Amino acid sequence: NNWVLLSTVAAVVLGITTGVLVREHSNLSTLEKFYFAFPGEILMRMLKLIILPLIISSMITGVAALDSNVSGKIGLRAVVYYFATTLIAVILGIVLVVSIKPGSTVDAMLDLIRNMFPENLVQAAFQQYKTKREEYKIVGMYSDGINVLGLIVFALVFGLVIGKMGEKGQILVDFFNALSDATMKIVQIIMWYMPLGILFLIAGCIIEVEDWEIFRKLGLYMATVLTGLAIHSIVILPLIYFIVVRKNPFRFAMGMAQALLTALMISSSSATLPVTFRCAEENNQVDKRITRFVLPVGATINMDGTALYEAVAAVFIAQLNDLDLGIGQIITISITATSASIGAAGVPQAGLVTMVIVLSAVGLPAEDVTLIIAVDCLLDRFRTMVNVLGDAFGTGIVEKLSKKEL
Amino acid sequence: NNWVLLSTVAAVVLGITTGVLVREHSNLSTLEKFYFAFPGEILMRMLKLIILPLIISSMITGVAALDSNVSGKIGLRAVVYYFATTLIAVILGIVLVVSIKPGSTVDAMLDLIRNMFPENLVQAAFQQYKTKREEYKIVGMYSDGINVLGLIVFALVFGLVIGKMGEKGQILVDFFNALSDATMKIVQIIMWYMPLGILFLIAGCIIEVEDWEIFRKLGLYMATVLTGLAIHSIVILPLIYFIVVRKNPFRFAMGMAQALLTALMISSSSATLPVTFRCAEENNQVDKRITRFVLPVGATINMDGTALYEAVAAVFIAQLNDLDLGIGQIITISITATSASIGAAGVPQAGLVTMVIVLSAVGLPAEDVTLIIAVDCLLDRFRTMVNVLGDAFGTGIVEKLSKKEL
Amino acid sequence: NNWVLLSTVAAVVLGITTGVLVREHSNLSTLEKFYFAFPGEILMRMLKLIILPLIISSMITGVAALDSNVSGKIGLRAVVYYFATTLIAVILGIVLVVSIKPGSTVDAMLDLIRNMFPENLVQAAFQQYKTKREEYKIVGMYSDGINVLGLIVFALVFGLVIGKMGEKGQILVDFFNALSDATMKIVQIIMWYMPLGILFLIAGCIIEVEDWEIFRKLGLYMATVLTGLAIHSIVILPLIYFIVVRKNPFRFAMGMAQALLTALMISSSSATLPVTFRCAEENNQVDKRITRFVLPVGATINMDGTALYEAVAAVFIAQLNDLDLGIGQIITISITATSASIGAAGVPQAGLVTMVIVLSAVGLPAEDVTLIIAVDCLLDRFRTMVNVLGDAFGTGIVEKLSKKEL
Ligand SMILES: N[C@@H](CC(=O)O)C(=O)O
């Protein structure tokens, strides 16, 4: 049966029901509220567990599947589509948030480059590099947090190398192919727990707000993000599809509707990836040759919704601090929000972990994330859907562009 | 020649001879006593080095060898036998130690679940998660120590997935098969150093006791553990064998006598595993199809002797602190001593590393292990033999149970 | 075109030109001098990134390629040549530096043995063990820094095991063969950035010296190292070649001249390894059977120039501190400088990272490396060439010795 979507929709409505009723008709202490969320914590453990094997294997196999530079044009065309749509999303976000106004830079910018090239691969798998100036002289240290941006850069370069080796590298192509499949089979196992975990992860999040004045304060911030995500997903992406693929874009989006609902409930572009393959191949009849690369790479590299959210959220917190952003600061937000979408993994609440980078790029305390944290579970559900939809339209686009070489 | 056992028996009697003579006829300072133990430290380095490759590869290959759910019944029947015998050992230990009386809980219990699902596999390979409440709000951090409990859970789930993939996963079945064999060949290399390391590791341990009043104080604690291990290995395990396999159990145990002596000297269920295969297959004529799974998995998951020792040791230290354990606390010791036997690796002195968890489950300082540490090298030799014997009887039992499906 | 050497020679002369002109005609602050070096920092990131995959895979494949103990004599003969030439280099360095005089030991010596056998392979990939005595009792802790000495020992032992397994281990032979090749293909990608990175890494190093009185102070230290490296490479190595291979040694060295210039510019024995294979096989016509083992293992194990430099540098800093070295201390420098050359990786500035060990072996502060750091980029270029030349002559030597078994 079509259990995945119906069970998760039930968990969402049961999570809201539980949270609203428990928040009103009970008085949990700050400690009891933490144990109440525990079944959702264990879900977040299981998903953070799997993003290391998943990102590594999907980067390597995706790139290594480009047998030669002729097929390499399919991969190249896709990464151009990824960067183009992400910048348009960030620019749209900045234009909105400075129109609505809902409210050490060099070191944070060079730290982006240092984190693409980590000094150690094993350390990069769980720690990330930060530099500070003191007395100035620069001092750097590692702090915990998977260096996803550096593992991506290595896995793309390492994937490219393996594919060029031909029959000499095939054992590594085969090893990471099997490891990629084994990882997607483990993710499908987590999907059995995910409905129950999503219930407590939704219920616990709305139990942890003391007053709706917190929700009213952030109402105009949600309007800015949800306005941007609406414009991006309903105007921009359908338009650039139609400009390339002279077919109705909403006909293509309607075929993904089962994947978009999944993304809108589980808040994980990586976990909805099996449903994305199902829709893209069978409803939209896209060539499996390209869907094997554009979907699994784009499921983490191409996060248009996160990039927009990061830019709106960072400028919003700057406005809350009266930090009147100059055009130079706006540009450093744009660059960091672009990189933060790439560095962010496709698991629930990955946008917040990278939010610290965009805040640091303008010197804002890393703890000012706690100004927006309360509503994030709502905007996370919508940004995830744009993270998938951006890849879906890209799959149809890349087919039309590549048709001379497929 | 049969060098392994005769050389290790010599090292044990030479270690006692050296330690007793050096303790009486010399006056090493606390510093010189540490350098005297150094050849035994390097042995402990070599064995801690190998338990990561060994646990990972033996979990994956053991489970992945269950070609289908028909053979999967052999693996399922075994894990039921593992859990049953371990609980009986823990319950026996608790009953004894409260009869003889030789003398934050929720956070430590939820930390067990958080450590089955680590946020990072590379971090889990060398760090383990602990939470504290402060101001309450819960704060968590990682501290060093291989998260064996989380690597087991992943390797069993990852092994299950690979086996279901069939011909698509065979490269990973083959890779971990070779890596499992390569690890057992390295362990056989350490066995050449082990006699010399065991000499200094035994001699140094009895040089580090200042007075025999330490040994007299712990005499009734040793009587409780060694009474429990005697009852478990001479009464309970032979009985549950006979109740399943209507054959004389001591005839089967006599065939293992060469493996039991090895375990009783090297204090390592993992290092004696090659001898366990030799006896189980050739003396006891057990089907190689089942011995390939019950022995190498049970060599670390099924540690009946450690589980009994953990429960007796934790209640003993509680009695030393006048911490009069309620029935609720006794239950939390039972659950944690069960998990601590699984989390403990099959290398000399692995019971102490996990002892900290059972102590923490009742709020006892982690340093109160130093109350029992002095005698542990003796009880380690006996608990190791029950850790092997539990797997040996399980191998004969699982054969009888599975005979309809072999 | 022969772009590698001509482009790097240009970067060196352009780096000196830039550094001298910027140092005179500009006044960078200590902060601006750090950002000026940044394009060279990113080069050091890329090379430190790759030494973990490179050392692991080259140890395993090199040893695992010795199909049997008959070919094993080729590998055995080589490691005898490695240790012999390294000790001769260290002894030459000690004799010089005590003739010219240009100016807790047990714990540091046992720490060498503890670091050959790490308690964890994943921790060894990025941390290294150090012990201290306090109140004495010994306390140990891990600190960051790849434990190259322990990864080598495991990879040689693990490589030996795989080769003995035959057809049962071939999947691991194949896996590390492909991973070794994939790593050398990534290093060849870094070579495209290396000219630009070498320019700023040379220019920035001479911008960071305030006065030439620093260079005059260290002039007699450079004379001691460069005298030792001249004697070792022009006298000793040609002699031991001629004593084994009764052919003109400078005819063989002239065939390597393209590899020696590469080593003398990029300061990386590992990065010049492809050029070393090219010269050794095609100019010097050495059997590919032996060059496949003596070059890639010797590219990190056999560092005769580093070992000489380490001994001269450590005794020099002792003389600066009036620490009048007894014959016992000289011996502990010899042992630690030998091990430090093995522990040092073949990337620019790897000698300094291990310098801390030789200083610690005689109790000198780890920060007294900053007494010699200023000139190190110059001596690094010359020591790298002796690190390659030692392997080159060894390749011709091992061919003559092994000719009865090839
Ligand atoms: N939850 C988003 C990631 C994010 O929130 O940044 C996704 O999986 O696409």
Ligand SMILES: N[C@@H](CC(=O)O)C(=O)O
């Ligand atoms: N030494 C035991 C483990 C322990 O003491 O906990 C064994 O190897 O079975």
Ligand SMILES: N[C@@H](CC(=O)O)C(=O)O
């Ligand atoms: N740069 C040297 C290593 C060192 O300086 O210690 C080499 O690659 O051979």
Ligand SMILES: [Hg+2]
């Ligand atoms: Hg929420």
Ligand SMILES: [Hg+2]
């Ligand atoms: Hg002992």
Ligand SMILES: [Hg+2]
């Ligand atoms: Hg320099």
Ligand code: NA
């Ligand atoms: Na994009």
Ligand code: NA
């Ligand atoms: Na995406």
Ligand code: NA
């Ligand atoms: Na991303």
Ligand code: NA
């Ligand atoms: Na058991």
Ligand code: NA
């Ligand atoms: Na066991």
Ligand code: NA
């Ligand atoms: Na265990």
Ligand code: NA
């Ligand atoms: Na040498």
Ligand code: NA
């Ligand atoms: Na070398």
Ligand code: NA
């Ligand atoms: Na070296």
